[PDB]
Amino acid sequence: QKTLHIYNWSDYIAPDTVANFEKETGIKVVYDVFDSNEVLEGKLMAGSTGFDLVVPSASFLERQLTAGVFQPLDKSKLPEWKNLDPELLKLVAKHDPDNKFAMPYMWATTGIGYNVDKVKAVLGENAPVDSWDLILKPENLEKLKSCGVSFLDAPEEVFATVLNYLGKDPNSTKADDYTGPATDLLLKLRPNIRYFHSSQYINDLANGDICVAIGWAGDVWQASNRAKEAKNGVNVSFSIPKEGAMAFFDVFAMPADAKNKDEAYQFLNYLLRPDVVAHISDHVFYANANKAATPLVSAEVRENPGIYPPADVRAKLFTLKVQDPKIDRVRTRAWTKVKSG
Ligand SMILES: [Cl-]
Ligand SMILES: [Cl-]
Ligand SMILES: [Cl-]
Ligand SMILES: [Cl-]
C-alpha cells in the first residue's frame, strides 16, 4: 500500500527494473531523475529531500555525512550485501568508513569520448587516442577546435585530471598548483573549447556535433549506442588514457528523514540480486559493483575495457579526496575564470 520515492541519475536504471520490482513486492515506486551532484546535494542540504533513496557520488556522500543528512544502513536487512565486490567496498570505504551509509551501485571513469572518424581525419591514423595528449595538449586541441570540443562542468574532476596529466598529485593540497600550472594549461586550451557541460556532450557525440569530449564512460557508451541504433554513421568510442584517469563510485543512500525505510531496504536488496543489477548494466553501459553479477552481464558490456577496465588500467586509476574549504574555494574560483575569458 505504501510508496517508495527514489531520486537517481538520468538513464541510470533499466526500463523494467522498477516495474519488475513493483510486481514482485506490490510496492508502488515513484521515480524522479537528476543530472548533477550539486543539484542533489542542494536538495539534501537545503532541507527535506522528500525521497527515501538517493544516489550521490561517493566523494560527495563523504561531505554530506559530516552534516548528518543520511541514516546508517541496517546490514541485517540487506542479506545479499555479500554479492558486492569487496575491493570496491574498500575504495568506497575511504568516503564512507566501514561502509555504514552507502551501498555501491555503479562505477566508471572520467575519460575521453571522441568521434573515431573525425579525430583520425584531423590528427591522422596515429592519433594519440590512448593519451590525454589528445585533448589536453594545445596543438592537438587547436586542430580539433573546428569539429567541436566540450569539457565537463566539473572543476574537481577536470583539475584532478589536469594535475595528474602535469605530473602533480591529482588531489594536490597546494593552492598554487591550481592557480598556477593547472590554470595556465586550462587557459591555453580554453579558446578551443566550445562549451562546458556535463550532459550535453552525450547527444552531441551521438549526432556528430562534437568530435571530442571529457566525459564519463557510461555516458559516452550510451552516446555510442544511440549512434549505432540510429544508423547515422557516427562512430563514437571511449578511452581511459595511459596517464591514468579519475574513477568515481555512485552509491545508494538513505536520507535520515526517509519515510518508508522498510520498502527502501527491499529495493536495495532487490538491486543486490545479481540478475537484477546485471540487467541494468546491460542497458546503461555502466559497470556495477556486484561481483556475483559480473558473469551475468552481457559480453558486449562485460568485455568492453572502457566499462570493465582490466587490472593494468585499474592500477593507474585515482579517486578524488575531499579538500578543505581553502582549496575548494581556490579551485572553484579558478574554474569560473576559465569558463569566462
Ligand atoms: Cl530515466
Ligand atoms: Cl557531478
Ligand atoms: Cl598543419
Ligand atoms: Cl541467492
**Which ligand is nearest to the Cα of residue 82, counting in written order?**
4
Resolution, expressed in angstroms to one decimal: 2.1
**Which sign does the torsion angle of CA 266, 300, 213, 234 carry?**
negative
- The answer to whether residues 123 and 133 touch, using CB atoms and an 8 Å cutoff, is no
- The answer to whether residues 209 and 193 touch, using CB atoms and an 8 Å cutoff, is no
Cell (9 digits) for 205? 557525440
Cell (9 digits) for 283? 542497458
Q: Supply the angle between the helices 261-271 and 17-25 in degrees, to the nearest 10.
A: 120
Experimental method: X-ray
Give the rounded distance of the alpha carbon of 158 from its chain centre.
Answer: 13
Residue 133 CA to residue 241 CA, distance in Å, equals 9
Residue 33 CA to residue 54 CA, distance in Å, equals 10
Cell (9 digits) for 183? 590554470
Residue 55 CA to residue 102 CA, distance in Å, equals 9
Say how many Å lie between the CA of residue 83 and the centre of ligand 1.
Answer: 25
- In the block, cell 536504471 appears at 13
**Which sign does the torsion angle of CA 306, 307, 312, 317 carry?**
positive
Are β-strands 102-115 and 236-239 bridged in parallel, bridged antiparallel, or unpaired?
antiparallel
Say how many Å lie between the CA of residue 1 and the centre of ligand 2.
Answer: 34
Cell (9 digits) for 20? 519488475
- Alpha-helix residue ranges (DSSP H) falling in 190-273: 200-207, 217-230, 261-271
Say how many Å lie between the CA of residue 288 and the centre of ligand 4.
Answer: 18
- The answer to whether residues 105 and 272 touch, using CB atoms and an 8 Å cutoff, is no
Among 217, 188, 190, smallest CA distance to 205 is for 217
- For 324, which DSSP code? P
Say how many Å lie between the CA of residue 156 and the centre of ligand 2.
Answer: 9
**Which ligand is nearest to the Cα of residue 80, counting in written order?**
4
Among 20, 23, 77, 12, smallest CA distance to 269 is for 77
Residue 233 CA to residue 271 CA, distance in Å, equals 36
- Residues at the binding site for putrescine are 10, 219, 250
Q: Supply the angle between the helices 200-207 and 217-230 in degrees, to the nearest 10.
A: 40
Contacts of 211 (CB under 8 A, 6+ apart): 114, 115, 118, 119, 122, 144, 147, 148, 149
**Which ligand is nearest to the Cα of residue 140, counting in written order?**
3
- The answer to whether residues 100 and 283 touch, using CB atoms and an 8 Å cutoff, is no
Say how many Å lie between the CA of residue 138 and the centre of ligand 2.
Answer: 26
- For 37, which DSSP code? H
Among 54, 44, 59, smallest CA distance to 156 is for 59
| Cα–Cα distances in angstroms (integers) from residue 47 to residues 35, 37, 42, 65, 68, in the given order | 19, 16, 9, 15, 12
Cell (9 digits) for 187? 587557459
Q: Nearest 5°: CA angle at 177, between 171 and 179?
A: 120
Contacts of 296 (CB under 8 A, 6+ apart): 274, 275, 278
How many residues comprise the chain? 341
**Which ligand is nearest to the Cα of residue 123, counting in written order?**
3
Determine phi and psi for 52, rounding to 5 degrees: -95, -25
Among 223, 216, 225, smallest CA distance to 245 is for 216
